[PDB]
Short mmCIF file of C-alpha atoms and ligand atoms in Angstrom, two decimals:
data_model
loop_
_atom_site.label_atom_id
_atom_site.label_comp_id
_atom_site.label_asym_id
_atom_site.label_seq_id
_atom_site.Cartn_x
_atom_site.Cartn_y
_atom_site.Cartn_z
CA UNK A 1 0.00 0.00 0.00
CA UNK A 2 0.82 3.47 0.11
CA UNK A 3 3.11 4.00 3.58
CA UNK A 4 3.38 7.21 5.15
CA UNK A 5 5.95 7.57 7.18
CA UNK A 6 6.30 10.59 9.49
CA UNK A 7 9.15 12.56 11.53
CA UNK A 8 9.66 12.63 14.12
CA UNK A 9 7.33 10.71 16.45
CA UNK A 10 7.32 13.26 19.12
CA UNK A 11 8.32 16.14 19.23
CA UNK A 12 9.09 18.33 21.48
CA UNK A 13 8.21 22.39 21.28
CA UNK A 14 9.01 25.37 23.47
CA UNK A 15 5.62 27.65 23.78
CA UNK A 16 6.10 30.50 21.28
CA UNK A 17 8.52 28.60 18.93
CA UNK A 18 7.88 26.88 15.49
CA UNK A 19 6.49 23.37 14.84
CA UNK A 20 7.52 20.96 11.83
CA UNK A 21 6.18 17.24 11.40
CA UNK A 22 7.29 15.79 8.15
CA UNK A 23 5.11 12.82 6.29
CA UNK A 24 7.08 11.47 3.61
CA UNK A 25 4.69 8.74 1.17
CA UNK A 26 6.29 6.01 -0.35
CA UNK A 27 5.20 7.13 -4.39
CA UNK A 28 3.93 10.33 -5.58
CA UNK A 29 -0.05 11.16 -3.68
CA UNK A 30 -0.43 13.59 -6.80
CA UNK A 31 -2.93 14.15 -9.59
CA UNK A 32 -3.73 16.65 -12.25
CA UNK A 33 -1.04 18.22 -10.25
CA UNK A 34 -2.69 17.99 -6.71
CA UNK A 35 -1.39 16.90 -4.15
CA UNK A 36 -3.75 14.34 -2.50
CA UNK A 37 -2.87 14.77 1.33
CA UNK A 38 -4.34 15.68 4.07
CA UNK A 39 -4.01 16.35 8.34
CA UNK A 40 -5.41 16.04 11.11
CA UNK A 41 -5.66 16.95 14.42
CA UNK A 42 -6.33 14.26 17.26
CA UNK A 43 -6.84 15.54 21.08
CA UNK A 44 -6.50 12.47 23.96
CA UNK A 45 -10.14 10.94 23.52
CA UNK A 46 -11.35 13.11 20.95
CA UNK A 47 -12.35 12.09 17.14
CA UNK A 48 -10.00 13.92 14.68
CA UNK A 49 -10.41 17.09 13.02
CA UNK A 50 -9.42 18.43 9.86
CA UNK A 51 -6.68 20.80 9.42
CA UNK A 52 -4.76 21.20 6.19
CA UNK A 53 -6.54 19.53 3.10
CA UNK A 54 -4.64 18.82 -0.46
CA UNK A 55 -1.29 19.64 0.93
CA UNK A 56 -2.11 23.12 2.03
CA UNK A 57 -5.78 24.94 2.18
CA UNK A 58 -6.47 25.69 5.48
CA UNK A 59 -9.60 24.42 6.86
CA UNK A 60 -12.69 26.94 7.27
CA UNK A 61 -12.14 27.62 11.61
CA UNK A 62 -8.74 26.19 12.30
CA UNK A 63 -6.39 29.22 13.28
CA UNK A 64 -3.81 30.56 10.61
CA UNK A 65 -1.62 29.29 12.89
CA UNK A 66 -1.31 26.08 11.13
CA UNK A 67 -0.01 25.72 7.52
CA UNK A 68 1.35 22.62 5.26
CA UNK A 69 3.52 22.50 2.15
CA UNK A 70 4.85 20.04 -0.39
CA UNK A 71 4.13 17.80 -3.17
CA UNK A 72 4.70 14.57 -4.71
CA UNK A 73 5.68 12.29 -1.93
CA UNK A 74 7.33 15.56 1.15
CA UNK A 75 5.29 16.91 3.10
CA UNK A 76 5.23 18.78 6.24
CA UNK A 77 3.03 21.02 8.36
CA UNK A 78 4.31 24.11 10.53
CA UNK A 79 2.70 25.58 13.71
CA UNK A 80 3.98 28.82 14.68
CA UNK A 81 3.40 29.98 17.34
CA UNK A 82 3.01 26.86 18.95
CA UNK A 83 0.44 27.17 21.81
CA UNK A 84 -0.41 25.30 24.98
CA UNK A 85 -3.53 23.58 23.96
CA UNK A 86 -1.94 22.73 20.18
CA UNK A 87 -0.62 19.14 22.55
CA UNK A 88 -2.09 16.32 20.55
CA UNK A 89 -1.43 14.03 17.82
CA UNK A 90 -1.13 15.06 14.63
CA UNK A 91 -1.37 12.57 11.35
CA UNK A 92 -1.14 12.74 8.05
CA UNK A 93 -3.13 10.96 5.29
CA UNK A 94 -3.54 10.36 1.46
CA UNK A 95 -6.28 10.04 -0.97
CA UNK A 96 -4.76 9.85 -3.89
CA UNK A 97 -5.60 6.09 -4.38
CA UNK A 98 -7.57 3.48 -2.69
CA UNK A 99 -6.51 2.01 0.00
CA UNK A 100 -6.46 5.34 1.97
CA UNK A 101 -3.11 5.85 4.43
CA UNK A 102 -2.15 7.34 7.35
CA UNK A 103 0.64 8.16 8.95
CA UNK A 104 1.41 6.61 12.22
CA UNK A 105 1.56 10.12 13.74
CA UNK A 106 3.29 12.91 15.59
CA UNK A 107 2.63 13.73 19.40
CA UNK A 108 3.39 16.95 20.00
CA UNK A 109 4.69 17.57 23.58
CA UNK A 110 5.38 21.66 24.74
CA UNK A 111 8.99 21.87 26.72
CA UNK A 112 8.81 23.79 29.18
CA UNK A 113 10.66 24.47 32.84
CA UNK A 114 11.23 21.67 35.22
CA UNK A 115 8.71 21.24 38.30
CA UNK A 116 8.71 19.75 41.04
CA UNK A 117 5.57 17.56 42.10
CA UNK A 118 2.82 17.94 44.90
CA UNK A 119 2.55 14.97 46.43
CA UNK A 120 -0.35 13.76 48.42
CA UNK A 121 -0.54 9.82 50.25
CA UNK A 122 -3.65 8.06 51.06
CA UNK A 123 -4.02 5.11 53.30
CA UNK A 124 -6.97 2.68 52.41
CA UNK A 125 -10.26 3.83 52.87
CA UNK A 126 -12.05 2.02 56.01
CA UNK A 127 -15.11 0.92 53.16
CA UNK A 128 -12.60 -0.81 51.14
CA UNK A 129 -10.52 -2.42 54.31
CA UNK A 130 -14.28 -3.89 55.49
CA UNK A 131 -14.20 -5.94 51.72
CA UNK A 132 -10.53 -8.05 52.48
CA UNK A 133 -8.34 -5.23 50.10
CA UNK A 134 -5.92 -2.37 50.94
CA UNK A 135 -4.84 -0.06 48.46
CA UNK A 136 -2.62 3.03 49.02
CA UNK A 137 -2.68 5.95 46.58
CA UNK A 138 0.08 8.32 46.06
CA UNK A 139 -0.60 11.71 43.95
CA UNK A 140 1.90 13.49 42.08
CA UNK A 141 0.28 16.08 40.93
CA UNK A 142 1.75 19.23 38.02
CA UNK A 143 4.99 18.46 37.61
CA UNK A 144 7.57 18.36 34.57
CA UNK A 145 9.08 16.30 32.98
CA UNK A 146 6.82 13.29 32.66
CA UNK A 147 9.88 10.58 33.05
CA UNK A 148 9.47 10.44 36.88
CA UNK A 149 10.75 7.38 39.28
CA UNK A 150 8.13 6.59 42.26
CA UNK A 151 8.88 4.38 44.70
CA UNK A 152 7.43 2.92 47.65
CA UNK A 153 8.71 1.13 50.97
CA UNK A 154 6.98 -0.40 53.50
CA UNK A 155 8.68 -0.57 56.86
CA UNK A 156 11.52 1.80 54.63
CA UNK A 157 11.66 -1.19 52.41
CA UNK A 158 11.24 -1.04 48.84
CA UNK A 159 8.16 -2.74 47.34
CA UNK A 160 7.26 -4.13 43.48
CA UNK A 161 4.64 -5.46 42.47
CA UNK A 162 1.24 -5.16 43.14
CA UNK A 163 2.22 -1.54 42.04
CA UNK A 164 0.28 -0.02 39.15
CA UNK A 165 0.89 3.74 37.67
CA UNK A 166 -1.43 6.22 35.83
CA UNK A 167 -0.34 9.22 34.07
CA UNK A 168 -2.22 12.25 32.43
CA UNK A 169 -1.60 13.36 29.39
CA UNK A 170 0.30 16.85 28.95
CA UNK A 171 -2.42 19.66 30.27
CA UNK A 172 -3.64 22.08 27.90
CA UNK A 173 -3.02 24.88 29.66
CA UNK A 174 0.18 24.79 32.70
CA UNK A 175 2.21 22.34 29.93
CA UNK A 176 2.58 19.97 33.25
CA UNK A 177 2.02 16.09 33.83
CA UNK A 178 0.04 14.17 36.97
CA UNK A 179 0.24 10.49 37.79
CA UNK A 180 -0.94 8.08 40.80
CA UNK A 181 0.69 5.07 41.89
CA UNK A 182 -1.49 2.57 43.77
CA UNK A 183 0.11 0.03 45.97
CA UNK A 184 -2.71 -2.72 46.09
CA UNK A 185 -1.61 -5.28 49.32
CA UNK A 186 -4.21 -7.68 50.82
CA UNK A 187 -5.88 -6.23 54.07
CA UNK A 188 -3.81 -9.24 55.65
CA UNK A 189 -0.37 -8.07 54.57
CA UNK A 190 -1.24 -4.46 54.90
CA UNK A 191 -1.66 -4.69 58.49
CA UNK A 192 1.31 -6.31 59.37
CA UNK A 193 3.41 -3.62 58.73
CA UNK A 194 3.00 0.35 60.13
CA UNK A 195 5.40 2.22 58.06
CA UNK A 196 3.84 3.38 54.10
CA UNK A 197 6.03 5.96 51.69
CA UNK A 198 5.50 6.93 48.36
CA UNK A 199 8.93 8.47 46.86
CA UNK A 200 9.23 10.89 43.67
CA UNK A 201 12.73 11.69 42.04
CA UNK A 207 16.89 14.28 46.38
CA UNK A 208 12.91 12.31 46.10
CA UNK A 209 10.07 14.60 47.22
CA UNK A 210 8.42 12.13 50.02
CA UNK A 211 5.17 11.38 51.54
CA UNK A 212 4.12 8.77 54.73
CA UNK A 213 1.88 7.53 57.56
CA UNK A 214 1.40 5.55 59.96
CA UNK A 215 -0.87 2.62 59.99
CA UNK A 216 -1.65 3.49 63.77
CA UNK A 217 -1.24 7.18 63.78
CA UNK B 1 -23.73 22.28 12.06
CA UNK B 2 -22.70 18.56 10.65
CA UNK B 3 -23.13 16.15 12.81
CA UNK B 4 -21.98 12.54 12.75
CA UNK B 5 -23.40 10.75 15.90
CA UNK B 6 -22.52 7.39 16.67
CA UNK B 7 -23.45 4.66 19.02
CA UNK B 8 -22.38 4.15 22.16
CA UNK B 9 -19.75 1.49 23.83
CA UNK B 10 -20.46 -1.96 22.61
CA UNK B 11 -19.12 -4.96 25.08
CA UNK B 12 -19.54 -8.09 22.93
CA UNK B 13 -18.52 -11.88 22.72
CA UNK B 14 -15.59 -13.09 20.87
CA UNK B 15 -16.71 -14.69 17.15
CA UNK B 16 -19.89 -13.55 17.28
CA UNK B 17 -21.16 -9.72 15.43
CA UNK B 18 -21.86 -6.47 16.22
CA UNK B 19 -23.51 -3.45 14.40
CA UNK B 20 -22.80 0.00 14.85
CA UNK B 21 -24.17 3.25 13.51
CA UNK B 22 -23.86 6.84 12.48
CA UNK B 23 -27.02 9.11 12.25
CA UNK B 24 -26.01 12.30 10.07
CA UNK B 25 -27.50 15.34 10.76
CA UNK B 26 -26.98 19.27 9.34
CA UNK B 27 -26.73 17.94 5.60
CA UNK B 28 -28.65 16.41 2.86
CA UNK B 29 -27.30 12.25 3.95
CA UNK B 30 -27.11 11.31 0.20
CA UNK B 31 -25.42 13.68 -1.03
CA UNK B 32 -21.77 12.73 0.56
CA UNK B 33 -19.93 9.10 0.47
CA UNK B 34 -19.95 7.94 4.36
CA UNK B 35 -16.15 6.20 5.16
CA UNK B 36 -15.40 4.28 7.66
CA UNK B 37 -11.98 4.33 9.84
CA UNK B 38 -10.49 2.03 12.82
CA UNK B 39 -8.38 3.63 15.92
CA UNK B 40 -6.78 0.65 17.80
CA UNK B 41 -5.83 2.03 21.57
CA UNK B 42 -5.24 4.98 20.70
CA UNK B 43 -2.40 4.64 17.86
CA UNK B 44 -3.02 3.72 14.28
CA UNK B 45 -5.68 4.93 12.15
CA UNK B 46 -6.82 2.13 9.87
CA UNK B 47 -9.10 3.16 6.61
CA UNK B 48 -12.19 0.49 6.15
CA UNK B 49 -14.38 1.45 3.21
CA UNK B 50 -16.92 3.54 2.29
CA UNK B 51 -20.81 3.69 1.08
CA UNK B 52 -22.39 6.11 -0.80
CA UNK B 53 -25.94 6.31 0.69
CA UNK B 54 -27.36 8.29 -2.55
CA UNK B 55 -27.08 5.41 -4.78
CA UNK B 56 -25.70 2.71 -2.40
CA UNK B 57 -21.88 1.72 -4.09
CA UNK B 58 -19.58 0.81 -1.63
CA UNK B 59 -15.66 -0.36 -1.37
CA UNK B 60 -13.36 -1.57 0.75
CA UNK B 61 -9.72 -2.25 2.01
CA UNK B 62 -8.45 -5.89 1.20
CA UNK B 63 -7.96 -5.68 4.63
CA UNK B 64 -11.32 -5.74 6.00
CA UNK B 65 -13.24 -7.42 3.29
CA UNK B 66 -14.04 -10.63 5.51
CA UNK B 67 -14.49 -8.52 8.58
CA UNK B 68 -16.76 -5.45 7.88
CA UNK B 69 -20.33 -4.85 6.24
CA UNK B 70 -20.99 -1.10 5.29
CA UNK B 71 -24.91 -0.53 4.90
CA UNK B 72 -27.37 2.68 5.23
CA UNK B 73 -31.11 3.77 5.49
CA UNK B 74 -31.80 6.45 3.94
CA UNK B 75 -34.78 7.28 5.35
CA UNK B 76 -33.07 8.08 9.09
CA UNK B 77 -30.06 9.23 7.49
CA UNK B 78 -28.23 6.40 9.16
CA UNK B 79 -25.06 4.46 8.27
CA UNK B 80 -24.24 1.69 9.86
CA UNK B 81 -21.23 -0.92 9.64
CA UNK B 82 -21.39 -4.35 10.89
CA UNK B 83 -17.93 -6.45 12.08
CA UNK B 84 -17.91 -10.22 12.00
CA UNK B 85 -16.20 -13.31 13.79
CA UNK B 86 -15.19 -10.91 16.66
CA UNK B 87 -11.65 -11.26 18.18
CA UNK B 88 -9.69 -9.28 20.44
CA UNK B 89 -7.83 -7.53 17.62
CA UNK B 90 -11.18 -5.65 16.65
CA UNK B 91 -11.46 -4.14 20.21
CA UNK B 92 -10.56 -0.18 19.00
CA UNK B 93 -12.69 2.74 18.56
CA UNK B 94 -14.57 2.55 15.12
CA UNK B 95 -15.17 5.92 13.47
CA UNK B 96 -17.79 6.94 10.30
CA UNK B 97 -16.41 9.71 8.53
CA UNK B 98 -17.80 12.45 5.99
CA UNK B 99 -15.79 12.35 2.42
CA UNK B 100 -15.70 16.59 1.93
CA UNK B 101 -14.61 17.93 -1.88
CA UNK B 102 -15.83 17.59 -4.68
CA UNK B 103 -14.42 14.25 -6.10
CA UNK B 104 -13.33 10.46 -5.14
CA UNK B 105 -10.30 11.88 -3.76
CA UNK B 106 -11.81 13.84 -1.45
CA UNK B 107 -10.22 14.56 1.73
CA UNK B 108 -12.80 13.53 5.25
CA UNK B 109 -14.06 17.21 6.69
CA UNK B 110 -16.12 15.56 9.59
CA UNK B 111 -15.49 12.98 12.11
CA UNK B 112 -17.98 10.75 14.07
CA UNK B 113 -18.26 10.91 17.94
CA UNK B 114 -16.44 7.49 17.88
CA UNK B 115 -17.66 3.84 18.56
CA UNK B 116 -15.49 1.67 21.34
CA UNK B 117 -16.04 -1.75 20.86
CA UNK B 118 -14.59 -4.11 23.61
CA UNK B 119 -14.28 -8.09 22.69
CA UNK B 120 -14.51 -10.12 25.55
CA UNK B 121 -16.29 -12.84 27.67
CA UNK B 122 -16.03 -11.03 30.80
CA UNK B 123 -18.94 -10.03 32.71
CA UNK B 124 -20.53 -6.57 33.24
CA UNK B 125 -19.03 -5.36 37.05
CA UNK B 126 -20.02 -2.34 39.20
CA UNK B 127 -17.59 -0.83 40.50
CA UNK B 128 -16.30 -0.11 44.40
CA UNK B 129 -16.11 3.30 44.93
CA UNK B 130 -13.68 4.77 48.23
CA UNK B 131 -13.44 8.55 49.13
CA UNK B 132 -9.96 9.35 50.00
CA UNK B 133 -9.74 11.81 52.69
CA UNK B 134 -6.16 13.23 54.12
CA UNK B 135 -3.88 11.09 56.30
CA UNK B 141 -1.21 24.17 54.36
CA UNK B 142 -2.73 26.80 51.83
CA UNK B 143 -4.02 23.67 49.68
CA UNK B 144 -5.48 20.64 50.48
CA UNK B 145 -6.13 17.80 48.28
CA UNK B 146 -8.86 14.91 48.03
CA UNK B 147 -9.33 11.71 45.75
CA UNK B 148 -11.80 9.19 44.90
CA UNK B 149 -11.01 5.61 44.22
CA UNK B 150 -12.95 4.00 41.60
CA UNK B 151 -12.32 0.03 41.49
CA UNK B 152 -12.82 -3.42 40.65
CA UNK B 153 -15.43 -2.36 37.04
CA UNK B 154 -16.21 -3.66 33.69
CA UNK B 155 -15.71 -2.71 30.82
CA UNK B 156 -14.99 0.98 30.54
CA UNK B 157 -16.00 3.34 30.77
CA UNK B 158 -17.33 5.05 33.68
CA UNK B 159 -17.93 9.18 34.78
CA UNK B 160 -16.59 11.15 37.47
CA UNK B 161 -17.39 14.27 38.81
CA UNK B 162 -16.69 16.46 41.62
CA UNK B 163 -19.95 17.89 43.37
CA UNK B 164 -22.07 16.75 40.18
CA UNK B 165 -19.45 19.22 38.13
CA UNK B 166 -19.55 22.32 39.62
CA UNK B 167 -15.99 21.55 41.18
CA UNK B 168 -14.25 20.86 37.85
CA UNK B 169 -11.41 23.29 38.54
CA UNK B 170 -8.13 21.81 40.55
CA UNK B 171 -9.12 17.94 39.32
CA UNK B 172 -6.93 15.13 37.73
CA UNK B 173 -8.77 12.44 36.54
CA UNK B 174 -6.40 9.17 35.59
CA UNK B 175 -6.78 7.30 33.19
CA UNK B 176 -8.14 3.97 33.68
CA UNK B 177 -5.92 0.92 34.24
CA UNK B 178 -6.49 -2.92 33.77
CA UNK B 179 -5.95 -4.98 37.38
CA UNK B 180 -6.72 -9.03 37.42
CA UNK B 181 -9.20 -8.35 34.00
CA UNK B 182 -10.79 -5.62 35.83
CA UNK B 183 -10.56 -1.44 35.66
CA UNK B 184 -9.32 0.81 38.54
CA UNK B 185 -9.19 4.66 37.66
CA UNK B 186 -8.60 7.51 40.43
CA UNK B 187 -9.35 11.46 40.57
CA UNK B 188 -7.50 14.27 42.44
CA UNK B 189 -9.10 17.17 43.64
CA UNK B 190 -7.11 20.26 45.06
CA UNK B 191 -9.16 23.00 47.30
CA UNK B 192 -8.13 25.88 48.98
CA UNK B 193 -7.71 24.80 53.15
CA UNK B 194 -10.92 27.11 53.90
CA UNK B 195 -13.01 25.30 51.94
CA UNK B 196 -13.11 21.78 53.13
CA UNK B 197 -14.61 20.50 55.32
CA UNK B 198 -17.02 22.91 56.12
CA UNK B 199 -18.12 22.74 52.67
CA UNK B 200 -18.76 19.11 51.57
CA UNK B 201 -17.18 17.57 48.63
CA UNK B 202 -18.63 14.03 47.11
CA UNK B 203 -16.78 11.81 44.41
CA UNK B 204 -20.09 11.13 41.86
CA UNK B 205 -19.37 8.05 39.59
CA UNK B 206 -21.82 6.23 37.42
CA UNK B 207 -20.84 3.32 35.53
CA UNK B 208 -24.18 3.14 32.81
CA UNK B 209 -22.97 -0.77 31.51
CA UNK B 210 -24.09 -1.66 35.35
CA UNK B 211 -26.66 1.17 35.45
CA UNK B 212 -25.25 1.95 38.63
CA UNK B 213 -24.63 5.49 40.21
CA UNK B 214 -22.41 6.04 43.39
CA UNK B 215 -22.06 9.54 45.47
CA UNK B 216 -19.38 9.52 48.09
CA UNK B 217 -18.68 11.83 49.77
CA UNK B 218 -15.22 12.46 51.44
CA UNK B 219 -15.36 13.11 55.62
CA UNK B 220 -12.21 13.71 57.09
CA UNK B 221 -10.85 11.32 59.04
CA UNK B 222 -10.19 9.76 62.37
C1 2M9 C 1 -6.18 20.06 -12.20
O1 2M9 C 1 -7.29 19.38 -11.59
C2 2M9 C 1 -7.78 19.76 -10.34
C3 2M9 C 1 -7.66 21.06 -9.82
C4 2M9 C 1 -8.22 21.38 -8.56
S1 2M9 C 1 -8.04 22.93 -8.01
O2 2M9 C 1 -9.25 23.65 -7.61
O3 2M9 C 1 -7.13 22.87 -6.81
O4 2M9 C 1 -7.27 23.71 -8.99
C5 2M9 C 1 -8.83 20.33 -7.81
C6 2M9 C 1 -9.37 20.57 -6.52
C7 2M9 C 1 -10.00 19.54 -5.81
C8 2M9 C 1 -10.16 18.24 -6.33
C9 2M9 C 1 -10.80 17.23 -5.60
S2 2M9 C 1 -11.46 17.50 -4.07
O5 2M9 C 1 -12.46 18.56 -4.18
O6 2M9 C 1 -12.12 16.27 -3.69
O7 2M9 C 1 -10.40 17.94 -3.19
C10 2M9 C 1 -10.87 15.93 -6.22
C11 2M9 C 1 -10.35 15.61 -7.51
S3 2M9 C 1 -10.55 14.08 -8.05
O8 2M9 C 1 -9.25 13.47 -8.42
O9 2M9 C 1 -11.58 14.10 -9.12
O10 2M9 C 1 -11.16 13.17 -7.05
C12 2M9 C 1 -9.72 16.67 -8.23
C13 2M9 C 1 -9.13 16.45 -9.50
C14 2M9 C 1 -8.52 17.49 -10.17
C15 2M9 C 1 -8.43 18.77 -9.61
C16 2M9 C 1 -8.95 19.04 -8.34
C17 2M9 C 1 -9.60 17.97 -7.64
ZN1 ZN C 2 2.52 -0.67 -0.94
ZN1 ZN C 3 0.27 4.92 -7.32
ZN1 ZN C 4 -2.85 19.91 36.76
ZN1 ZN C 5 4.77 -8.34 54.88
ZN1 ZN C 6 6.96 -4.60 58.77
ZN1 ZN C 7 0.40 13.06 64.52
#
């Protein structure tokens, strides 16, 4: 089929500053002279949306802002400024000939300053302890950059598995990152030990006491 | 204003079928070829086929041609696309699609609100749902949503009028079952005097949950 292959897979953009996402096609995607391709848009959990059509008409609504060039089988599309709420993915696609292609896409992540995160523990809830389960929840909330280490000890020693991690996507607007770790124990094991810590990386760290 | 509305989350059986559909609105529905397109979590777009309600000619990727029906009524503007011999690799998010220009090469101007379909055997499961309360200026709350099936379910903070200050994480897979969370960050004056309650409905159990978070101890 017709691959499209794009550049690079993420990439990452200081507010203010100029985005470029390539899509190279394995053959020519023109005719008459046209170039037959196409991007989109794609926000986390949101159906795509149209920005650039044959190469580069801009799409009735989306901000001037975005533009695309090329022909025949390299292609790219700019941002400039890029702004906070342009994180998403961004693919691009031909129509030239059946089967239609897309590319495998483009996340666009903002760079921005390094932050620290907030970080909040939670022993089990006294509903779930009544139901034979004990899960601990750590929240590290706005920080940057997403590639943060969390661990937790029990009695100051470290634990894995049973330990599962959940991560936001970039917000739109402060450019930062959340995630909670859960430390899942049976109500058994739990309560055999009183020391809980969740660690972020010198780590930001929070505890309690099982009795306290 | 076009509108492509599809049906909601489908959990269905492996090898057996399920139908989906797309009721256009804001246009004349024959006038514009109808494609279909496949997201598998949440990477790849995959292009199906397409019907052309006007007439009723249709095509489709090599790809799919065992695996996907494309039909429409025209009288309820409706696409609809069936998918056969179900297996795990056809759980993804199934989207109809508007063909815009003026010709066969036509570039898709509108998107469909999006179909998930989940493949399994697994059972329909309400979820538990725990308020997290505390062990300065800020304080900050969560809600534990676990133990459901399939996805998805809602959360709010105080039905939605506390939408400022929340993270809500994405859901994760534990023993075949979902466990999401939600953050929410207050100023210190605010709670607990003023009373803040975790809603979560999970409609696949028709069940509906409001917790509220008291401090502890
Ligand atoms: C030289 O031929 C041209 C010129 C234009 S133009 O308006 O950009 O000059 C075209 C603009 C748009 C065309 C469109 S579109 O409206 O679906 O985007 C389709 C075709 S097609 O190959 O007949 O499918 C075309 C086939 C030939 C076309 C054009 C299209
Ligand atoms: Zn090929
Ligand atoms: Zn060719
Ligand atoms: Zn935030
Ligand atoms: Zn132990
Ligand atoms: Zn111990
Ligand atoms: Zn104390």
């Amino acid at each position: 089929d017709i691959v499209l292959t794009q550049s690079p897979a993420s990439l990452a953009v200081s507010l203010g500053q100029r985005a470029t996402i390539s899509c190279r096609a394995s053959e020519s995607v023109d005719s008459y002279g046209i170039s037959f391709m196409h991007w989109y848009q794609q926000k986390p959990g949101q159906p795509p949306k149209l920005l650039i059509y044959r190469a580069s008409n801009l799409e009735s609504g989306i901000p001037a802002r975005f533009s695309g060039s090329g022909s025949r089988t390299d292609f790219t599309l700019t941002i400039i400024p890029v702004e906070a709420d342009d994180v998403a993915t961004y693919y691009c696609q031909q129509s030239n000939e059946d089967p239609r292609t897309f590319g495998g896409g483009t996340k666009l992540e903002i760079k921005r300053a390094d932050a620290a995160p907030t970080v909040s523990i939670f022993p089990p809830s006294s509903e779930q302890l009544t139901s034979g389960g004990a899960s601990v929840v750590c929240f590290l909330n706005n920080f940057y950059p997403k590639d943060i280490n969390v661990k937790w000890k029990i009695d100051g020693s470290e634990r894995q598995n049973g330990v599962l991690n959940s991560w936001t996507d970039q917000d739109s607007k402060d450019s930062t990152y959340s995630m909670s770790s859960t430390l899942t124990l049976t109500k058994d094991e739990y309560e055999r030990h009183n020391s809980y810590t969740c660690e972020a990386t010198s780590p930001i760290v929070k505890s309690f006491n099982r009795n306290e | 204003e076009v509108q492509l509305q599809q049906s909601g989350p489908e959990l269905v059986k492996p090898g057996t079928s399920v139908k989906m559909s797309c009721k256009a609105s804001g246009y004349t529905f024959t006038d514009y070829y109808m494609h279909w397109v496949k997201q598998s979590h949440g990477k790849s777009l995959e292009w199906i086929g397409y019907i052309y309600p006007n007439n009723g000619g249709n095509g489709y990727n090599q790809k799919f041609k065992g695996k996907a029906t494309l039909t429409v009524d025209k009288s309820s503007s409706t696409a609809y696309m069936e998918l056969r011999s179900l297996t795990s690799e056809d759980s993804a998010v199934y989207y109809c699609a508007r063909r815009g220009g003026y010709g066969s090469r036509g570039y898709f101007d509108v998107w469909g609100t999006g179909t998930t379909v989940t493949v399994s055997s697994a059972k329909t499961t309400a979820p538990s749902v725990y308020p997290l309360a505390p062990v300065g200026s800020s304080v900050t709350l969560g809600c534990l949503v676990k133990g459901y099936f399939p996805e998805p379910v809602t959360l709010t903070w105080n039905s939605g009028s506390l939408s400022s200050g929340v993270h809500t994480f994405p859901a994760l897979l534990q023993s075949g079952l979902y466990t999401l969370s939600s953050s929410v960050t207050v100023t210190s004056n605010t709670w607990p005097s003023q009373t803040i309650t975790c809603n979560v409905a999970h409609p696949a159990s028709s069940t509906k949950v409001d917790k509220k978070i008291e401090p502890r101890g």
